Structure formats: structure tokens, C-alpha cells
Design a protein around this ligand. Structure first.
Ligand SMILES: Nc1nc2c(ncn2[C@@H]2O[C@@H]3COP(=O)(O)O[C@H]4[C@@H](O)[C@H](n5cnc6c(N)ncnc65)O[C@@H]4COP(=O)(O)O[C@H]2[C@@H]3O)c(=O)[nH]1
Lengths: 178, 178
């Protein structure tokens, strides 16, 4: 299954590698690089899962209330022959009524971009209906992996959505629960 | 198909992104950072495809004649909400009879590590026989993608192998053809 392989590669090649050290990288940022007068970055990696697989490269293009602020400390390591491969994450501010209502580590799940592009390339033999069903299967498999995964211990939140709708608000709703 | 999705994600999320700018990054290295007295780095990205999916993180652990030298200039760009995500590659020297017989950009195809780990995790429902058959399907799909891909224009070489056997020699054989 396309989505089954994609869900497992996202855990094996990314989540299980960065989640153990995520809270440490955030506490490091909150103490030494975060502006002294600002709210602390929240402790979890928030992952956006648009089921229509529309994954823009700039998050501020999906909502103007979502604005880039800073990058976490970079995590590097040797991986499949690549020396010091860089895993980077970005901190965003979420604006409500124009003012900062919260800060969090936010990104899209990249494998959804793969399902999108696969639906566009003829040689992939992958229809736009395949995409919606595989997008849902990808998220189910992922939350099933992370439930049993030892690396996910209150440090990761999946935010699936389908499109009116405000992404900045959908994130803030999860953020306000904690 | 697990390998079908993995082969397409490797093209969409990596090869089609780095191959257009690979030769430019190599010429930049050969002129400004390569030691003036050394042989030029070859122009292609050589990708190792062990069908047993044994992908060590340090290439020198698979063969002592393969020694790290330097990194190419890093390629950065915004991707799925990650600002300045870093794509890095490593240059290796290949020793024959103890002396440098060639230099090239070399790495393993990371999705093979995914197939390996999937075969080890019970929740993946993926047997070691599934792995060998999916490993072969992954490479077939990949070379079929790159044949028709506009980004692959004499800048990428797939080296599939199955294990005596010397990895440094198998690479040098491809290198000596050109
Ligand atoms: N050698 C090498 N291969 C790379 C690199 N980046 C991607 N690949 C490969 O391309 C394929 C698809 O790319 P994608 O981002 O869709 O999936 C990635 C992506 O969702 C997530 N991920 C991995 N590294 C990062 C990262 N640095 N930043 C954000 N997300 C990441 O986990 C998935 C699996 O990662 P893997 O690791 O196996 O790299 C393979 C991947 O199979 C790279 O920088 N170096």
C-alpha cells in the first residue's frame, strides 16, 4: 500500500529520529534564543495533515495569520552515508485579532506532497480518487504508529483537516487545549 | 504498493529537487573548495542500492577503502513549511591498492532503510521476503522514473548489488566507464 509505506517511512526516517530530542531543542530555544519578553514555545511538534494534499511550501501562503519567527537549533547526524544530514524545524506565531495568540513548532507532513504529485504524474498510475483514500489511510496508519511508538510521549500532535475555514484558528484550538 | 510509493517519494521529494542543481554544485566545489592538486569530482550522483537493504549510516563501515573527504555546498529551500530545509551531499574517495583511484558524490538510497526497518517492526505487517521483492520493485520503478525524468540528464547512476564482494571496486567499475 502506497500510504502504508509512506506512513512508515515518515516514522522511521523522521519522527522516530527527531521526537526523542525535540523537547530538549525547544527548551534550549526558550532559554537562550527566544526573546526574553515573549511567550515560551509550546512543547509539541504540530503536524498539519490536509487531506486534499494541498501542501504549500510557505505556511504564510495558507494563512496570513501564520507568520514565521525563528528556527529551532538544528539537529544533525550521519544517515545512509550522508555526513551531518540536517533536520531543521521552524517556529511560527499564530495571530488572532491581529495580535500573537501563541507560538508553536509547526509544519506539514511532507509525504502528503508526494501523494499530490503522484496524482499529477501520468507514469505514477495514481488517480485523484486514489489520493483522497490514500491520504486518509496515511493519517490513520500514522496515528496508529505513534500511539504505540515509544518516541511519541506527549510531544507530537496530528492536525487533520478538510476544507469558511481558518488554519490559524484550527491550530489555536489544539494549542489552547494544551 | 509500498515500493511504488517509496520510489516515487524519492524522486518527488529528493531527486527531482537536487539533480537540476547537482552539476553546478560540483563545478563550484571543484573550482573553489577542492584541493588544487587533487582530481576533480566526477559529475554524477552515485546511488548505492543494496538489495538486502543493509544501509549503514557510515559508508566507511561498509568498506574501509571508501573514505569521507568533504561536503558539497549545501542546497537549501523552503519545503512543506520548513524554512531553509538543508539538502546535503558527501564526497568520498575510493582507494585501490591503498591509493586514491577516484572521487565521487556517493550515498545510499535512504528508502531502502525504510524497507529494512519495516521488516523488523511487527506492527508493519511486512516480512523479510516482502523486503527482497519490494527492494527489487523499488529499484525497477526508480530507474523507470529516471529514464523519462527531465531532471536526470547524465547526472545520476544507480548501482544495485547483492552480496568476495568489494563495494569500493563495484563503484570504481562504474566510475571507470565514466
Ligand atoms: N540522502 C538524502 N535523502 C533524502 C533527503 N531528503 C529526502 N530524502 C529522501 O526522499 C524521500 C521522500 O522525501 P520526503 O521529504 O517526502 O519524506 C521524508 C519527510 O517526510 C520526513 N523528513 C526526513 N528528513 C526531513 C527533514 N530534514 N525535514 C523535514 N522532514 C523530513 O521523513 C520522510 C522520509 O525520509 P527519508 O530520510 O527516508 O528520505 C528520503 C525519502 O524517502 C536528504 O536530505 N538526503
Amino acid at each position: 500500500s502506497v500510504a502504508h509505506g509512506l506512513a512508515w517511512s515518515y516514522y522511521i526516517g523522521y519522527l522516530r529520529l527527531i521526537l526523542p530530542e525535540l523537547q530538549a531543542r525547544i527548551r534550549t530555544y526558550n532559554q537562550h534564543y527566544n526573546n526574553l519578553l515573549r511567550g515560551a514555545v509550546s512543547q509539541r511538534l504540530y503536524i498539519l495533515l490536509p487531506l486534499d494534499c494541498g501542501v504549500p511550501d510557505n505556511l504564510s501562503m495558507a494563512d496570513p495569520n501564520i507568520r514565521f519567527l525563528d528556527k529551532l537549533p538544528q539537529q544533525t547526524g550521519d544517515h545512509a552515508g550522508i555526513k551531518d544530514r540536517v533536520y531543521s524545524n521552524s517556529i511560527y506565531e499564530l495571530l488572532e485579532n491581529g495580535q500573537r495568540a501563541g507560538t508553536c513548532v509547526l509544519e506539514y507532513a511532507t509525504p502528503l506532497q508526494t501523494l499530490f504529485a503522484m496524482s499529477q504524474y501520468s507514469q505514477a498510475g495514481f488517480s485523484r480518487e486514489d489520493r483522497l483514500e490514500q491520504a486518509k489511510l496515511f493519517c490513520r496508519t500514522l496515528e496508529d504508529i505513534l500511539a504505540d511508538a515509544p518516541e511519541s510521549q506527549n510531544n507530537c500532535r496530528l492536525i487533520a483537516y478538510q476544507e469558511s475555514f481558518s488554519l490559524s484558528q484550527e491550530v489555536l484550538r489544539h494549542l489552547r487545549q494544551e
